[PDB]
Ligand SMILES: Nc1ccc(CNC(=O)Nc2ccc(S(=O)(=O)c3ccccc3)cc2)cn1
């Protein structure tokens with residue numbers, strides 16, 4: 001069972017003896033710190049953490065004794081605030097006397113703005129605020145995935161619109177392939193759900209259960225997929241029977257969309273000779289609602305995609321759309337699901353546009369690039385203390401390393417507001433109390449063990465929409 | 472609760488309709504596929520996966536119905552193999568008819584060798600082999616962390632030995648700071664435990680319980696830490712009271728080691744004026760078993776470390792060790808825990824060496840670089856089918872993309888052997904049965920729902936030792 005007393009950085013166990021004596025309050029905030037591009041971020045993932053790890057009775061006699069035993073060996077010393085945790089158990093029935101206020105999930109906020117604040121509600125629990133920093137900071141991941149996924153959506157929207165004249169099916173242009181490529185099962189579900197903020201296609205099943213349990217959607221499921229082959233279902237037929245493999249698979253899935261990896265031995269042979277001649281008759285008869293999706297999986301992503309399109313373009317009836325770009329027949333599409341990150345995605349669609357190929361023809365699958373190749377310093381997700389009350393006096397506190405002005409933190413009590421021009425601004429030093437900037441955008445989402453405000457995955461998707469989608 | 476039927480890539484749900492008819496066997500393997508660095512990998516993490524996810528009754532009536540309902544909406548169609556999973560439930564009481572053979576955990580194996588193999592033990596469950604691919608491929612992470620952590624230990628060993636003459640305290644030279652920097656709680660435990668294969672210092676507590684539960688050690692805990700400050704325990708005192716903060720903290724932890732982050736406002740001022748002058752009397756009186764550890768946390772890592780060292784060098788009695796390198800007094804040490812990955816680590820220790828500073832003086836803390844900034848691409852961890860039996864005929868299968876020879880996979884039944892020179896070699900096409908390379912070094916670790924072989928964390932650590940560590944005496 002999960003023990004909150006064992007879910008923090010080791011050194012934080014000793015922090016209760018380090019704060020100034022007579023401190024009744026520690027007030028801390030979280031931000032995606034600005035750097036001297038990712039200029040805006042999707043806030044998402046906190047609600048998962050609040051429900052799974054923070055709410056309800058999270059402190060028991062056993063969990064205190066368990067932590068006491070581990071830390072005694074871990075530090076080779078008795079440093080442990082047993083009295084502090086005992087107080088929470090006896091006074092609040094193990095509920096955390098903590099208040100968390102946050103911007104609504106799905107909200108797109110520019111860098112350098114307060115996203116959520118944390119403070120203690122009982123003077124005795126001044127130390128508790130930063131105890132849970134570690135677990136709260138891990139919200140960097142769904143934030144970063146949601147943000148990076150959305151930035152890829154912008155690129156896709158831009159080129160799809162320019163080459164086709166609309167945004168039909170945009171929410172299916174980036175498919176999640178990252179299940180095997182992430183660090184754990186929990187990460188898989190969290191990352192997949194963050195991608196589903198922007199798109200509807202995934203193969204990381206674990207994301208669906210997470211969303212249903214912690215967020216919920218009106219639709220039965222927030223994510224979908226199509227039948228598809230892997231290298232094993234092709235190669236098992238033997239080197240000389242790749243055509244037999246292809247034919248068997250498209251026949252088994254003739255009434256639904258089907259993706260078939262075609263690079264097992266020779267991708268260019270498979271497209272031109274096998275799909276393009278030998279099995280062409282099984283392709284041109286397929287429904288528009290059930291196309292074949294050819295899937296390359298090796299070589300230079302841009303060069304391979306272009307050559308595949310070039311090959312298919314001469315074996316299948318190609319039309320030219322109203323924008324002047326070439327379009328494959330509705331029964332034939334391509335997915336590039338290898339080597340795809342935000343960088344190569346940009347290079348590929350730009351490369352396609354150069355060769356007069358519409359983005360209608362292609363979709364992208366991304367695994368490690370989508371869910372794993374991301375870190376905390378990408379958006380500079382940081383948790384810092386900005387306000388304390390010592391001896392009854394409030395103090396505006398901050399860090400400001402001389403050798404790195406970028407790591408400077410904000411001072412005092414914070415609030416997030418709309419600017420007159422409709423942008424965002426974070427007010428420091430409690431200046432939000434002057435009420436010159438309208439209502440604080442931060443809402444109490446957690447207080448004293450209870451989740452006080454929630455959001456459905458539907459609301460979140462609404463909030464995180466692209467401007468071009470709104471227009 | 473965990474549902475193994477819902478713990479695979481979506482398209483694998485449709486794969487049982489795609490294999491050649493009358494296929495009774497699917498046999499697959501796992502390798503860190505070959506391509507100058509990371510030439511050998513530490514195999515670790517599979518035992519965790521086997522116990523937490525694969526062993527015992529992992530199939531129930533409810534889990535089948537649950538998966539059925541999800542996939543129906545997920546695919547907008549009914550492609551779920553309900554009959555297949557029912558067979559497993561009815562015939563084997565939910566236990567997976569799978570055999571897994573694997574190299575011992577902790578073992579150090581060169582790239583391009585078979586690390587583990589998977590095959591179905593029931594002809595009916597031919598589809599089961601690659602269903603669990605996704606869940607097994609995730610072992611890439613503890614493999615990659617342990618490997619990357621060990622490569623850093625090599626760097627540390629080299630420079631510590633050269634600057635000091637020995638390797639005393641090497642296992643504490645790289646500390647885990649990555650709890651907040653990973654993608655989840657589970658990842659935190661898995662990653663931290665992987666680091667602990669090579670070192671003993673961690674702040675990621677979640678690693679301890681994982682090891683105790685799934686691996687075990689003779690000692691009460693596999694990892695240790697020391698009292699330390701964060702910026703909040705310094706800045707809360709106020710801008711003009713950094714000295715008071717320092718003094719309070721070192722006094723509270725006067726008889727134990729204590730790390731104190733010193734860059735809140737001015738790292739160079741804190742080292743020279745506050746530590747080096749104002750509170751000097753509180754530092755030189757400290758025990759050798761309870762030193763102050765000064766912690767910079769900003770600026771260019773190499774430049775900052777050298778400057779901090781030069782500053783302390785002129786404020787404290789520095790000695791020169793037997794190798795001719797400068798050494799801080801035993802009550803004073805430094806940890807650099809910002810911007811540390813395998814590349815910057817190398818740059819720092821080399822820079823220290825050129826300035827005649829011993830690696831005895833310093834230790835490193837690493838967070839995102841140690842536990843998060845890693846992918847499956849790094850060691851090319853890959854799972855591939857190499858052998859099937861269809862119509863009673865065994866077929867050696869493989870992929871070999873025309874545009875990427877590096878993605879070529881191995882053929883047929885695999886086995887791992889010792890060469891006459893004592894190296895590793897992977898034999899393909901069932902050639903291991905020729906008995907020219909002796910016995911298969913793989914062990915059956917999982918069979919029919921039961922873990923058949925396992926390793927304590929102590930033995931895993933022993934297996935993962937460095938050659939330089941083994942050279943004794
Ligand atoms: N890890 C993994 C998982 C799975 C795979 C292989 N599956 C795979 O490619 N599926 C796939 C393909 C295409 C599209 S689509 O383009 O959105 C599309 C959808 C419907 C109709 C037309 C087009 C969606 C899904 C590889 N690796």
Ligand SMILES: Nc1ccc(CNC(=O)Nc2ccc(S(=O)(=O)c3ccccc3)cc2)cn1
Nearest residue numbers: 009011643646648674697699728730764806834
């Ligand atoms: N995420 C996190 C966690 C924690 C921190 C700050 N804690 C921290 O630096 N601890 C620390 C310091 C030094 C050493 S040591 O050098 O191995 C050492 C050990 C004993 C005696 C002498 C020397 C080990 C641990 C930052 N970030």
